[PDB]
């Protein structure tokens, strides 16, 4: 009974703009290794770090761009909150 | 509780004995509307809110939740 492995839903974390973005470029997703599509828009956040988030409070979080399932970091920051 | 989003569909309808609950994301703030399916197994898999199957299993679910037989 298996289902693809870009099928998960996926962490985010929502801004001031209309669209909410990745929390990093990868995870774990049915048995694979779920990448997000290169040019995706994320921040360079850790999971984990991300699980502890109070939510509603902003946080300063660093921008980036999905390449090979990494978040890279784009050296700027803008308002973000967990939780659409 | 909106703290994820759906960034692809499955591509193939899961049979309904498989299927637990479901959510909806209607939030704008997601790449696109979504139908996120739990399974029986707690696997959570992102589906296409206009594919009749999906449409179909929710509502067999509501009406599981609705008429349950003791």
């Given at each position: 009974y298996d289902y693809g492995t870009d099928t998960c839903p996926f962490p985010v974390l929502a801004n001031k703009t209309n669209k909410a973005k990745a929390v990093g470029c990868h995870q774990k997703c049915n048995g694979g290794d779920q990448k997000l599509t290169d040019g995706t828009a994320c921040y360079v956040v850790e999971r984990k770090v991300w699980d502890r988030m109070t939510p509603m409070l902003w946080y300063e979080c660093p921008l980036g761009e999905c390449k090979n399932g990494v978040c890279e970091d784009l050296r700027k920051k803008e308002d973000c909150r967990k939780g659409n | 509780a909106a703290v994820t989003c759906c960034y692809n569909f499955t591509n193939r309808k899961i049979?309904?004995?498989?299927?637990?609950s479901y959510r909806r994301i209607?939030?704008?703030?997601?790449p696109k509307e979504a139908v996120i399916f739990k399974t029986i197994v707690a696997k959570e898999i992102c589906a296409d809110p206009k594919q009749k199957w999906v449409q179909d299993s929710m509502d067999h679910l509501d009406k599981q939740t609705q008429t349950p037989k003791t």
């Open positions: - | 049979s309904v004995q498989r299927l637990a209607t939030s704008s703030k997601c």
